[PDB]
Coordinates of C-alpha atoms in Angstrom, one line a residue:
Chain F
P1 CA -45.8 18.4 -51.4
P2 CA -49.0 15.9 -52.4
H3 CA -52.5 17.1 -51.9
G4 CA -54.3 15.2 -48.7
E5 CA -57.4 14.8 -50.7
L6 CA -55.4 12.4 -52.8
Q7 CA -55.4 10.2 -49.8
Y8 CA -59.1 9.8 -50.2
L9 CA -59.4 9.6 -53.9
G10 CA -56.7 6.8 -53.6
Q11 CA -58.8 5.0 -50.8
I12 CA -61.7 4.7 -53.1
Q13 CA -59.3 3.4 -56.2
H14 CA -58.9 1.0 -53.5
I15 CA -62.2 -0.1 -52.5
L16 CA -63.1 -0.3 -56.3
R17 CA -60.2 -2.4 -57.3
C18 CA -60.4 -4.7 -54.2
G19 CA -63.7 -4.4 -52.2
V20 CA -65.8 -7.3 -51.7
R21 CA -69.6 -7.5 -51.6
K22 CA -71.0 -6.9 -48.2
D23 CA -74.6 -6.0 -47.3
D24 CA -75.7 -3.5 -44.7
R25 CA -78.3 -3.9 -42.0
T26 CA -80.8 -3.5 -44.7
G27 CA -79.6 -6.0 -47.4
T28 CA -78.5 -3.2 -49.8
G29 CA -75.0 -4.5 -51.0
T30 CA -71.8 -2.5 -51.2
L31 CA -68.2 -3.1 -52.1
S32 CA -66.2 -3.1 -48.5
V33 CA -62.7 -3.2 -47.3
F34 CA -61.6 -3.6 -44.0
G35 CA -59.1 -1.2 -42.2
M36 CA -58.1 2.2 -43.3
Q37 CA -56.3 5.7 -42.4
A38 CA -55.3 8.8 -44.0
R39 CA -53.8 11.8 -42.4
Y40 CA -55.0 15.0 -42.9
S41 CA -52.6 18.1 -42.4
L42 CA -54.5 21.2 -40.4
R43 CA -51.5 23.1 -40.8
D44 CA -54.2 25.3 -41.6
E45 CA -55.3 24.2 -44.9
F46 CA -59.0 22.9 -43.8
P47 CA -59.9 19.5 -45.5
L48 CA -63.2 20.2 -46.7
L49 CA -63.2 18.3 -50.1
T50 CA -63.0 19.7 -53.2
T51 CA -63.8 17.4 -55.7
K52 CA -67.0 17.4 -54.6
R53 CA -69.2 20.0 -52.4
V54 CA -69.6 18.9 -48.9
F55 CA -72.7 20.5 -46.9
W56 CA -70.7 22.8 -44.6
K57 CA -73.6 25.0 -42.7
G58 CA -74.3 20.9 -41.9
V59 CA -71.1 19.8 -40.2
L60 CA -70.9 23.2 -38.6
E61 CA -74.4 23.4 -37.1
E62 CA -74.6 19.8 -36.4
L63 CA -71.6 20.4 -34.3
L64 CA -72.7 23.2 -32.1
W65 CA -75.9 20.8 -31.8
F66 CA -73.5 18.0 -30.3
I67 CA -71.4 20.5 -28.4
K68 CA -74.6 21.7 -26.8
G69 CA -75.0 18.3 -25.6
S70 CA -78.3 18.1 -27.5
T71 CA -80.3 14.9 -28.2
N72 CA -83.7 16.4 -30.1
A73 CA -83.4 15.9 -33.7
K74 CA -86.0 18.8 -33.5
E75 CA -83.5 20.9 -31.5
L76 CA -81.7 20.7 -34.7
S77 CA -84.3 21.2 -37.6
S78 CA -84.8 24.2 -35.9
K79 CA -81.9 25.4 -37.3
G80 CA -82.4 24.2 -40.9
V81 CA -80.8 20.9 -41.3
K82 CA -83.0 17.6 -41.3
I83 CA -80.1 14.9 -41.5
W84 CA -80.8 13.7 -38.5
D85 CA -84.6 14.5 -38.4
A86 CA -85.3 11.5 -40.3
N87 CA -84.7 9.4 -37.1
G88 CA -86.7 11.2 -34.6
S89 CA -90.0 10.7 -36.7
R90 CA -93.1 8.7 -34.9
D91 CA -93.1 5.9 -37.6
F92 CA -88.9 5.4 -37.0
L93 CA -89.2 5.8 -33.4
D94 CA -92.0 3.2 -33.1
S95 CA -89.9 0.9 -35.6
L96 CA -87.5 0.3 -32.9
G97 CA -90.1 0.2 -30.5
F98 CA -89.7 3.3 -28.5
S99 CA -93.4 3.9 -28.8
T100 CA -93.6 6.4 -25.9
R101 CA -90.7 8.7 -26.3
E102 CA -92.3 11.7 -28.0
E103 CA -91.5 13.4 -31.6
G104 CA -87.7 13.7 -32.2
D105 CA -85.9 12.2 -29.1
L106 CA -82.9 10.6 -30.7
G107 CA -82.4 8.8 -27.4
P108 CA -78.7 9.3 -25.9
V109 CA -76.4 10.1 -28.7
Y110 CA -73.2 12.1 -29.3
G111 CA -74.4 14.9 -27.3
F112 CA -75.1 13.0 -24.4
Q113 CA -72.1 10.6 -24.5
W114 CA -70.3 13.9 -25.0
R115 CA -71.4 15.3 -21.8
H116 CA -73.2 12.9 -19.6
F117 CA -71.1 9.7 -20.6
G118 CA -73.0 7.1 -17.9
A119 CA -75.5 9.3 -16.4
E120 CA -78.8 7.5 -16.9
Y121 CA -81.1 8.4 -20.1
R122 CA -84.5 9.9 -19.0
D123 CA -85.6 12.0 -22.2
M124 CA -84.4 14.9 -24.3
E125 CA -85.3 17.0 -22.1
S126 CA -84.8 16.0 -18.4
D127 CA -82.1 18.5 -17.5
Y128 CA -78.7 16.6 -17.1
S129 CA -76.5 19.0 -15.6
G130 CA -73.3 17.9 -13.5
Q131 CA -74.9 14.2 -14.5
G132 CA -72.2 11.5 -16.0
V133 CA -69.1 12.5 -17.1
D134 CA -68.4 15.3 -19.4
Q135 CA -65.6 13.9 -21.6
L136 CA -65.6 16.7 -23.8
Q137 CA -64.4 19.0 -20.8
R138 CA -61.8 16.5 -19.6
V139 CA -60.4 16.2 -23.0
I140 CA -60.0 20.1 -22.7
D141 CA -58.8 20.2 -19.1
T142 CA -56.3 17.6 -19.7
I143 CA -54.8 19.2 -23.1
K144 CA -54.2 22.4 -20.8
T145 CA -52.8 20.7 -17.7
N146 CA -50.6 17.8 -19.7
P147 CA -50.7 17.9 -22.9
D148 CA -48.5 14.5 -23.1
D149 CA -51.2 12.8 -21.7
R150 CA -51.1 9.8 -23.8
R151 CA -54.8 9.2 -22.8
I152 CA -56.9 12.1 -24.2
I153 CA -59.8 10.1 -25.4
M154 CA -63.6 10.7 -26.0
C155 CA -65.5 7.9 -26.6
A156 CA -69.3 7.7 -27.8
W157 CA -69.4 4.1 -27.0
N158 CA -72.0 3.2 -24.5
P159 CA -73.2 -0.6 -24.9
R160 CA -75.3 -0.1 -21.4
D161 CA -76.5 2.7 -23.9
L162 CA -76.6 1.3 -27.1
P163 CA -79.6 -0.8 -27.1
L164 CA -81.4 2.3 -27.1
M165 CA -80.2 5.2 -29.7
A166 CA -81.9 6.3 -32.8
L167 CA -78.5 4.3 -33.9
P168 CA -75.0 3.5 -32.4
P169 CA -72.3 5.8 -33.7
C170 CA -69.8 5.6 -36.1
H171 CA -67.6 7.4 -34.2
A172 CA -66.6 5.1 -31.5
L173 CA -63.8 7.1 -30.4
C174 CA -61.2 10.0 -30.9
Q175 CA -58.3 10.6 -29.1
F176 CA -56.0 13.9 -29.3
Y177 CA -52.6 14.5 -29.0
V178 CA -50.0 17.4 -28.4
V179 CA -46.4 18.0 -29.3
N180 CA -44.5 21.6 -30.1
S181 CA -47.9 23.1 -29.3
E182 CA -49.5 21.5 -32.2
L183 CA -52.7 19.3 -31.7
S184 CA -53.9 16.6 -33.5
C185 CA -56.7 14.4 -33.6
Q186 CA -57.3 11.0 -34.5
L187 CA -60.7 9.2 -35.0
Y188 CA -62.1 5.4 -35.3
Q189 CA -65.2 5.6 -37.3
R190 CA -66.5 2.0 -37.1
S191 CA -68.4 2.1 -40.3
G192 CA -67.7 4.5 -43.4
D193 CA -69.9 5.4 -46.4
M194 CA -67.0 6.9 -48.4
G195 CA -69.4 8.3 -51.3
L196 CA -71.3 10.4 -49.3
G197 CA -70.4 11.1 -45.5
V198 CA -66.6 10.2 -45.2
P199 CA -65.9 13.7 -46.5
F200 CA -68.7 15.5 -44.0
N201 CA -67.0 13.5 -41.1
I202 CA -63.6 14.5 -41.8
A203 CA -65.1 18.4 -41.8
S204 CA -66.5 17.3 -38.7
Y205 CA -63.3 16.2 -36.9
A206 CA -61.2 18.7 -38.7
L207 CA -63.5 21.5 -37.1
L208 CA -63.8 19.8 -33.7
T209 CA -60.1 20.0 -33.7
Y210 CA -59.7 23.6 -34.6
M211 CA -62.2 24.5 -32.0
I212 CA -60.2 22.9 -29.7
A213 CA -56.7 24.2 -30.6
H214 CA -58.6 27.7 -30.2
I215 CA -60.0 27.3 -27.0
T216 CA -56.5 25.8 -25.6
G217 CA -54.4 28.0 -27.9
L218 CA -53.0 25.3 -29.4
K219 CA -51.7 25.0 -33.0
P220 CA -53.7 22.7 -35.3
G221 CA -51.8 19.4 -36.4
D222 CA -53.0 16.4 -38.1
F223 CA -56.2 15.0 -38.1
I224 CA -56.3 11.1 -38.6
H225 CA -59.0 9.3 -40.1
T226 CA -59.4 5.8 -38.9
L227 CA -61.9 3.5 -40.5
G228 CA -63.1 -0.1 -40.1
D229 CA -65.7 -1.0 -42.6
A230 CA -65.0 1.2 -45.2
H231 CA -67.4 0.8 -48.0
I232 CA -69.0 2.3 -51.2
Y233 CA -72.7 1.6 -52.1
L234 CA -73.3 0.4 -55.6
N235 CA -75.5 3.1 -57.1
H236 CA -72.3 5.2 -56.4
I237 CA -69.7 3.5 -58.4
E238 CA -70.8 5.3 -61.1
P239 CA -70.7 9.0 -60.3
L240 CA -67.5 8.0 -58.2
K241 CA -66.1 6.7 -60.7
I242 CA -66.4 10.2 -62.6
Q243 CA -65.5 12.0 -59.8
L244 CA -62.2 9.8 -59.2
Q245 CA -61.0 11.6 -62.4
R246 CA -61.5 15.4 -60.9
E247 CA -58.1 17.3 -60.1
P248 CA -58.2 18.3 -56.4
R249 CA -58.3 21.9 -56.1
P250 CA -56.6 23.7 -53.0
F251 CA -58.4 23.3 -49.6
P252 CA -60.2 26.5 -48.1
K253 CA -58.4 28.1 -45.1
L254 CA -60.9 28.4 -41.9
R255 CA -61.1 31.5 -39.9
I256 CA -62.2 32.2 -36.5
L257 CA -63.6 35.5 -35.8
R258 CA -63.7 36.1 -32.2
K259 CA -61.2 34.8 -29.6
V260 CA -63.5 32.8 -27.6
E261 CA -62.8 30.8 -24.5
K262 CA -65.3 28.2 -23.1
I263 CA -65.7 25.6 -25.8
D264 CA -69.7 25.7 -25.2
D265 CA -69.6 29.4 -25.8
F266 CA -68.8 28.9 -30.0
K267 CA -71.6 30.0 -31.9
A268 CA -72.3 29.6 -35.8
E269 CA -70.9 33.0 -36.7
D270 CA -67.7 32.6 -35.0
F271 CA -66.1 30.8 -37.9
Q272 CA -66.1 31.5 -41.6
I273 CA -64.9 29.2 -44.3
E274 CA -62.9 30.9 -46.9
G275 CA -62.1 30.0 -50.4
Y276 CA -63.9 26.8 -51.0
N277 CA -64.2 26.1 -54.8
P278 CA -65.4 22.5 -54.9
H279 CA -65.8 21.0 -58.3
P280 CA -69.5 21.5 -59.3
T281 CA -71.8 18.5 -60.0
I282 CA -72.4 14.8 -60.5
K283 CA -74.6 11.7 -61.7
Chain C
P1 CA -45.6 -12.8 -51.2
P2 CA -43.7 -9.4 -49.6
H3 CA -43.2 -10.4 -45.9
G4 CA -45.4 -8.8 -42.9
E5 CA -42.6 -7.9 -40.1
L6 CA -41.6 -5.3 -42.7
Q7 CA -44.8 -3.5 -41.9
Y8 CA -43.8 -2.9 -38.4
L9 CA -40.0 -2.7 -39.5
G10 CA -41.5 0.2 -41.7
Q11 CA -43.6 1.7 -39.0
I12 CA -40.3 2.0 -36.7
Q13 CA -37.6 3.1 -39.5
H14 CA -40.4 5.9 -39.7
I15 CA -40.6 7.3 -36.1
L16 CA -37.0 7.0 -35.5
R17 CA -36.3 8.9 -38.5
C18 CA -39.2 10.7 -38.0
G19 CA -40.6 10.9 -34.5
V20 CA -40.4 14.2 -32.3
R21 CA -39.1 13.8 -28.7
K22 CA -42.0 13.3 -26.1
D23 CA -41.7 12.7 -22.7
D24 CA -44.2 10.2 -20.9
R25 CA -46.2 10.0 -17.3
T26 CA -42.8 9.8 -15.6
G27 CA -41.1 12.1 -17.9
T28 CA -39.0 9.5 -20.0
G29 CA -38.4 10.3 -23.4
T30 CA -39.7 8.6 -26.5
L31 CA -39.4 9.7 -29.9
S32 CA -42.9 9.7 -31.0
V33 CA -45.4 9.5 -33.7
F34 CA -48.6 9.8 -33.8
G35 CA -51.2 7.5 -35.9
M36 CA -50.3 4.3 -37.8
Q37 CA -52.2 1.4 -39.2
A38 CA -50.5 -1.8 -40.1
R39 CA -52.6 -4.9 -41.7
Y40 CA -51.4 -8.6 -40.6
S41 CA -52.4 -11.4 -42.7
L42 CA -53.7 -14.4 -40.6
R43 CA -53.9 -16.7 -43.4
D44 CA -52.2 -19.9 -42.7
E45 CA -49.8 -17.8 -41.0
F46 CA -49.8 -16.3 -37.4
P47 CA -47.8 -13.3 -37.0
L48 CA -45.5 -13.9 -34.2
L49 CA -42.8 -11.8 -34.4
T50 CA -39.3 -13.0 -35.9
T51 CA -36.8 -10.6 -35.9
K52 CA -37.2 -10.1 -32.2
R53 CA -38.3 -13.1 -29.9
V54 CA -41.9 -12.8 -28.5
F55 CA -42.6 -13.9 -25.1
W56 CA -45.3 -16.3 -26.4
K57 CA -46.1 -18.4 -23.1
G58 CA -46.5 -14.7 -22.0
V59 CA -49.1 -13.9 -24.9
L60 CA -50.9 -17.4 -24.8
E61 CA -51.3 -17.3 -20.5
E62 CA -52.5 -13.7 -20.7
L63 CA -55.4 -13.9 -23.2
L64 CA -56.8 -17.0 -21.4
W65 CA -56.8 -14.8 -18.3
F66 CA -58.6 -12.2 -19.8
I67 CA -61.1 -14.6 -21.4
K68 CA -62.0 -15.5 -18.0
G69 CA -62.8 -12.0 -16.9
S70 CA -60.2 -12.0 -14.3
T71 CA -58.9 -8.9 -12.5
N72 CA -56.2 -10.1 -9.6
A73 CA -53.1 -10.2 -11.1
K74 CA -51.3 -12.9 -9.0
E75 CA -53.7 -15.1 -10.8
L76 CA -52.0 -14.8 -13.9
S77 CA -48.4 -15.1 -12.3
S78 CA -50.3 -18.2 -10.8
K79 CA -50.1 -19.6 -14.2
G80 CA -46.7 -18.7 -15.0
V81 CA -46.0 -14.8 -16.2
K82 CA -45.0 -11.9 -14.7
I83 CA -46.0 -8.9 -17.1
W84 CA -48.7 -7.4 -14.6
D85 CA -47.2 -8.0 -11.5
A86 CA -45.5 -4.9 -9.8
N87 CA -48.9 -3.5 -10.7
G88 CA -51.1 -4.8 -8.2
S89 CA -47.7 -5.7 -5.9
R90 CA -48.4 -3.3 -3.1
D91 CA -46.5 0.1 -3.6
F92 CA -48.3 0.5 -6.8
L93 CA -51.8 0.8 -5.3
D94 CA -51.6 4.0 -3.2
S95 CA -49.2 5.7 -5.6
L96 CA -52.8 5.7 -6.9
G97 CA -54.6 5.8 -3.2
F98 CA -56.0 2.4 -3.4
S99 CA -56.2 1.2 0.0
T100 CA -59.2 -0.1 1.2
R101 CA -58.6 -2.8 -1.8
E102 CA -56.9 -6.6 -1.4
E103 CA -53.6 -7.2 -3.2
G104 CA -53.1 -8.5 -7.0
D105 CA -56.2 -6.4 -7.5
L106 CA -55.9 -4.1 -10.5
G107 CA -59.5 -2.7 -10.6
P108 CA -62.0 -3.2 -13.6
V109 CA -59.4 -3.7 -15.9
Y110 CA -60.0 -5.5 -19.5
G111 CA -60.9 -8.8 -18.3
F112 CA -63.3 -7.2 -16.1
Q113 CA -64.8 -5.2 -18.9
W114 CA -65.1 -7.8 -21.7
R115 CA -67.4 -9.7 -19.8
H116 CA -69.1 -7.2 -17.3
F117 CA -69.6 -3.5 -18.9
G118 CA -71.6 -1.0 -16.7
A119 CA -70.9 -3.3 -13.7
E120 CA -70.5 -1.7 -10.2
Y121 CA -66.9 -2.7 -9.6
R122 CA -66.2 -3.7 -6.0
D123 CA -63.1 -5.8 -5.4
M124 CA -61.3 -8.5 -7.4
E125 CA -63.0 -11.6 -5.1
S126 CA -66.5 -11.1 -6.3
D127 CA -68.8 -13.5 -8.4
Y128 CA -69.8 -11.3 -11.1
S129 CA -72.0 -13.2 -12.7
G130 CA -75.4 -12.1 -14.1
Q131 CA -74.5 -8.3 -14.1
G132 CA -73.2 -5.8 -16.5
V133 CA -73.0 -6.7 -20.6
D134 CA -70.8 -9.6 -21.9
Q135 CA -69.5 -7.2 -24.6
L136 CA -67.3 -10.2 -25.2
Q137 CA -69.7 -13.1 -25.9
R138 CA -72.2 -10.9 -27.8
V139 CA -69.9 -10.5 -30.3
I140 CA -69.4 -14.2 -30.7
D141 CA -73.4 -14.1 -30.7
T142 CA -73.5 -11.4 -33.3
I143 CA -71.2 -13.2 -35.8
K144 CA -72.5 -16.6 -35.5
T145 CA -76.0 -15.5 -36.0
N146 CA -75.1 -12.7 -38.6
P147 CA -71.9 -11.5 -39.5
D148 CA -72.8 -8.6 -41.7
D149 CA -73.1 -6.6 -38.9
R150 CA -70.7 -3.6 -38.6
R151 CA -70.9 -3.1 -34.9
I152 CA -69.0 -5.9 -33.0
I153 CA -67.0 -3.8 -30.9
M154 CA -65.5 -4.8 -27.8
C155 CA -65.3 -1.4 -26.1
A156 CA -62.9 -1.5 -22.9
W157 CA -62.4 2.2 -22.4
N158 CA -64.9 2.9 -19.9
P159 CA -64.5 6.7 -18.4
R160 CA -66.7 6.0 -15.4
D161 CA -64.2 3.1 -14.3
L162 CA -61.3 5.4 -15.0
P163 CA -60.6 6.7 -11.5
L164 CA -61.2 3.3 -9.9
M165 CA -58.2 1.4 -12.3
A166 CA -54.8 0.2 -12.0
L167 CA -53.6 0.6 -15.4
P168 CA -55.6 2.5 -18.0
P169 CA -56.1 0.2 -21.0
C170 CA -53.7 0.6 -24.2
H171 CA -56.4 -1.5 -25.9
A172 CA -59.7 0.9 -26.3
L173 CA -61.4 -1.0 -28.5
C174 CA -61.9 -3.5 -31.1
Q175 CA -64.2 -4.3 -34.2
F176 CA -64.6 -7.6 -36.0
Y177 CA -65.8 -7.7 -39.6
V178 CA -66.6 -10.8 -41.5
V179 CA -66.9 -11.3 -45.1
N180 CA -67.1 -14.2 -47.2
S181 CA -66.5 -16.3 -44.3
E182 CA -63.3 -14.9 -43.0
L183 CA -63.3 -13.1 -39.7
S184 CA -61.0 -9.8 -39.2
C185 CA -60.3 -7.6 -36.5
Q186 CA -58.7 -4.3 -36.2
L187 CA -57.7 -3.1 -32.8
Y188 CA -57.4 0.6 -31.6
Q189 CA -54.6 1.2 -29.8
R190 CA -54.6 4.4 -27.2
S191 CA -50.5 4.0 -27.3
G192 CA -47.9 1.7 -28.0
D193 CA -44.3 0.9 -27.2
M194 CA -42.4 0.0 -30.7
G195 CA -40.1 -1.5 -28.3
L196 CA -41.4 -4.0 -26.5
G197 CA -45.2 -3.3 -26.5
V198 CA -46.6 -3.9 -29.8
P199 CA -44.5 -7.2 -31.1
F200 CA -46.8 -8.5 -28.1
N201 CA -50.1 -6.8 -28.7
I202 CA -50.2 -7.9 -31.9
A203 CA -49.9 -11.7 -31.0
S204 CA -52.5 -11.2 -28.5
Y205 CA -55.1 -10.0 -30.6
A206 CA -53.8 -12.3 -33.4
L207 CA -54.5 -15.3 -31.5
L208 CA -57.5 -13.5 -30.1
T209 CA -59.1 -13.9 -33.5
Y210 CA -58.0 -17.6 -34.1
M211 CA -60.2 -18.1 -31.4
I212 CA -63.2 -16.6 -32.5
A213 CA -62.9 -18.1 -36.2
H214 CA -62.3 -21.6 -34.5
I215 CA -65.5 -21.1 -32.2
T216 CA -67.1 -20.0 -34.9
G217 CA -66.3 -22.2 -37.5
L218 CA -64.7 -19.2 -39.8
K219 CA -61.7 -18.6 -41.0
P220 CA -59.0 -15.9 -39.9
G221 CA -58.8 -12.8 -42.1
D222 CA -57.1 -9.6 -41.2
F223 CA -55.5 -8.2 -38.0
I224 CA -55.4 -4.6 -38.8
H225 CA -53.2 -2.9 -36.0
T226 CA -54.1 0.8 -35.2
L227 CA -52.2 2.9 -33.5
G228 CA -52.5 6.3 -31.5
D229 CA -48.9 7.2 -29.8
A230 CA -46.6 5.1 -31.1
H231 CA -43.4 5.6 -29.8
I232 CA -39.7 4.4 -29.3
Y233 CA -38.0 5.1 -25.7
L234 CA -34.7 6.8 -26.4
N235 CA -33.4 3.9 -24.6
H236 CA -34.3 1.2 -27.2
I237 CA -33.0 3.0 -30.0
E238 CA -29.4 1.9 -30.7
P239 CA -30.5 -1.7 -30.0
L240 CA -33.4 -1.2 -32.5
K241 CA -31.2 0.1 -35.1
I242 CA -29.4 -3.4 -35.1
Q243 CA -32.7 -5.5 -35.2
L244 CA -32.9 -2.9 -37.5
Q245 CA -30.3 -4.9 -39.6
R246 CA -31.8 -8.2 -39.4
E247 CA -34.0 -9.8 -42.2
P248 CA -37.2 -11.8 -40.7
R249 CA -38.1 -15.1 -41.9
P250 CA -41.7 -16.6 -42.6
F251 CA -43.9 -16.7 -39.9
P252 CA -44.6 -19.7 -37.7
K253 CA -48.1 -21.2 -37.9
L254 CA -50.8 -22.0 -35.2
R255 CA -52.6 -25.2 -34.9
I256 CA -55.5 -25.1 -32.4
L257 CA -55.4 -28.9 -31.1
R258 CA -58.9 -30.3 -29.8
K259 CA -62.0 -28.8 -30.7
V260 CA -63.6 -26.1 -28.7
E261 CA -67.5 -25.6 -28.0
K262 CA -67.4 -22.4 -26.1
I263 CA -64.4 -19.6 -25.9
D264 CA -64.0 -20.1 -21.9
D265 CA -63.3 -23.6 -22.8
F266 CA -59.8 -22.9 -23.9
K267 CA -56.8 -24.5 -22.3
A268 CA -53.0 -23.4 -23.2
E269 CA -52.1 -27.0 -24.1
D270 CA -54.6 -26.2 -26.9
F271 CA -51.9 -24.2 -29.0
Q272 CA -49.0 -25.9 -31.1
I273 CA -47.2 -23.2 -32.9
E274 CA -45.4 -24.4 -36.2
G275 CA -42.6 -24.4 -38.9
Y276 CA -42.0 -21.5 -36.3
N277 CA -38.7 -19.8 -37.2
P278 CA -37.8 -16.7 -34.5
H279 CA -34.6 -14.3 -34.5
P280 CA -32.5 -13.1 -33.0
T281 CA -30.2 -13.4 -31.7

């Protein structure tokens, strides 16, 4: 009954064997292919990657972060995570010629497009209550009232807003879907760095999904991952070549600890990842 | 090579023996599958499907209508095509409470949002010029200038404009990607009718692409189709089982005939399909 992580390993056989060179915004070249999709069963495995450690705590805590609507890279390092921190620094702000907006303020990103979609952005502390659409709710509410709705979609794409985020998202969009009280997710990431980011995202949306099956008391179905610019950077050919050699381990199970029923209620303890045995370390 | 309609023949072959039964907004059934993707070559073929005739005027008049950022549907009939008709013909408006409206008026549907993102939609009569975000053209901008960008996205799925709308868009978003000179495009499709949606919406986008590659001096690369709710109507099953018995042949070919400076300058008279064989029947 084939292991879902083969889907990813296989995508990387692909991009190695067929990718073409393509530079990013900063000139570094990569090997890129355009158009891809793997499917992960959540039938309660949790597709946290085995042939290498992904940073759980990170995923986790980053989500509670968007979940809470937040836009301060600062609000987030308070919780010991510096993956966004980097785009909140005076310097980086300034680059983009936001020389006003004070340290940490990421502009309008996931978390504000996630709950104030179309609300005018003042700053990362201007209280935004009731303002803009709260697509996180409506996804939920629709799930609970008609689950055959064939448009339960959350978008982080705002052109009106893009000329204006620390960056544009590469989760443009995710849709959900429901049948036999099983819930599935599908995600459209415009740009995918499989070496070092892809596996995080899957976590990240496998998480989201669980959270939602929970609050709506559905069962978890497939996560489907969809990419446009799937690329590996060149430094990584190496190490991935090694890693593409590892044999996947069982995916862990993810438990939830505490029947909890607003989405926004969840808290870092509420889950606990169980039996994650990632192979070690690569270079 | 190995032919491309096989893709789609696959996708279906799949659903109909693997999809679960799932009902739509007017409780009709659907064997249904969630999530696929198929890649269609645009390299000196254009991939109009064969095993099933597609309404091509239909497709070739629909985009141009989009291109021009039109939202009154009777404009599209106008030009010979009835797809989007009883959708702005009277009854289908207050079934959604649309009343202080005028008729053929679909609201801030696709055409509207390609050329005017985050712009207050009023009615269909209204010069729209200057306000919003010409997501569309910007896309042509961002290619010409600089093709590496990984962000060309023409997103229609506006949640604010979502009460206001006749139909919600099936096509929430696409990305182009150009490498080594060829252009590609991926459409993410909320939901898609394997019966009688898809053959069409592929076309539409393909042809979309030939239009940008042409305008931008680039050559068409790949159209990758992405679906969300892919489904067959229980209705279409027995017939499909039949085109399921049909072997499809080479694609046609599609030669733009004049030479076009901006996108809005297109004219239908501008497209010959070529060595085009369509079945059935």
